[PDB]
Amino acid sequence: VRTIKVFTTVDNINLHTQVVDMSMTYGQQFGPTYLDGADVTKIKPHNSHEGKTFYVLPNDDTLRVEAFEYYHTTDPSFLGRYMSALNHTKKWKYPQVNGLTSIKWADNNSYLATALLTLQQIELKFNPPALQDAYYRARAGEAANFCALILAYCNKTVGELGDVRETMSYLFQHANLDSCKRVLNVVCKTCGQQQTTLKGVEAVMYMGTLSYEQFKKGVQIPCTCGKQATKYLVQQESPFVMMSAPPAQYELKHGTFTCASEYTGNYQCGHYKHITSKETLYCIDGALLTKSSEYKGPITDVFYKENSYTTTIK
Numbered sequence: 001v002r003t004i005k006v007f008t009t010v011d012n013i014n015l016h017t018q019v020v021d022m023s024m025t026y027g028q029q030f031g032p033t034y035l036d037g038a039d040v041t042k043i044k045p046h047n048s049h050e051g052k053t054f055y056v057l058p059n060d061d062t063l064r065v066e067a068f069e070y071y072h073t074t075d076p077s078f079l080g081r082y083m084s085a086l087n088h089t090k091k092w093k094y095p096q097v098n099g100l101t102s103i104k105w106a107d108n109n110s111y112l113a114t115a116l117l118t119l120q121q122i123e124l125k126f127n128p129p130a131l132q133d134a135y136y137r138a139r140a141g142e143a144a145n146f147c148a149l150i151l152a153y154c155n156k157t158v159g160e161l162g163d164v165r166e167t168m169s170y171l172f173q174h175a176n177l178d179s180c181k182r183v184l185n186v187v188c189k190t191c192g193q194q195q196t197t198l199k200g201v202e203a204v205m206y207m208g209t210l211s212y213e214q215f216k217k218g219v220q221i222p223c224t225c226g227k228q229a230t231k232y233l234v235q236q237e238s239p240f241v242m243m244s245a246p247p248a249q250y251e252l253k254h255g256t257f258t259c260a261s262e263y264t265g266n267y268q269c270g271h272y273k274h275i276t277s278k279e280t281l282y283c284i285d286g287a288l289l290t291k292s293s294e295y296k297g298p299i300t301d302v303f304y305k306e307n308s309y310t311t312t313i314k
């Protein structure tokens with residue numbers, strides 16, 4: 001029998017020596033098999049494959065533990081989906097735009113570009129080693145693995161319509177936000193006052209207004225009694241806050257926010273751009289860059305810097 005030595009892996013760190021029969025496909029010997037994202041399941045070993053690393057699915061206890069420790073998921077289709085995405089994202093270009101790693105437009109990826117740009121402007125530490133390692137590479141300019149992981153974690157395929165708010169929620173669920181705390185008060189003229197404390201991801205995300213200042217002053221929401229009540233921020237402890245809303249025309253003022261996402265389109269398709277407030281307002285659209293002193297557009301998400309806030313409302 002003719003053979004070569006190859007290595008299998010689920011995390012591309014821990015390698016497992018294999019001797020493969022060159023007369024059988026990889027799939028016949030390992031199950032679904034991938035070589036830097038390419039599906040080689042139906043391929044027979046080549047001599048140039050000797051010594052190379054192949055991803056496989058977790059099909060024994062060692063690999064199951066290695067995969068969970070690296071990715072913090074046990075979804076059976078995760079690795080196949082990660083590899084399927086990577087086969088595309090490894091072909092994308094990741095230019096440095098105004099000091100940040102962006103993504104050249106491809107494969108309807110504008111939501112991923114503004115998510116990637118945003119991450120580089122807020123204080124966030126990921127928990128899965130896979131995201132820690134891939135984010136480090138992304139910041140350096142090699143973002144293919146990070147982008148493919150975002151797709152895999154969010155159960156999105158390359159080319160599929162994505163929402164920035166939902167994408168950030170997934171990423172935040174895999175980040176250490178345990179120190180983040182939000183205290184809110186809701187005041188109804190009929191029912192009185194009710195305080196609520198939120199933690200973790202729920203402490204840094206709000207859906208309903210783009211304005212952090214409005215959230216501090218009070219937003220109108222329905223009370224269960226039927227009257228409109230006012231909800232306002234009592235206390236905030238976090239390094240950033242994310243304020244989101246359905247797209248609406250909104251003015252972004254230099255120096256009053258960190259960055260923002262703009263969505264032009266409708267519920268079936270559209271396009272995202274990124275706005276960042278630095279020495280002026282920069283609009284990053286994949287590889288494209290423009291600047292302006294003022295900015296108005298259909299904004300969906302705005303990010304703000306924070307440390308500790310306490311209301312003066314009594």
Ligand SMILES: [Zn+2]
Nearest residue numbers: 188191223225
């Ligand atoms: Zn009420």
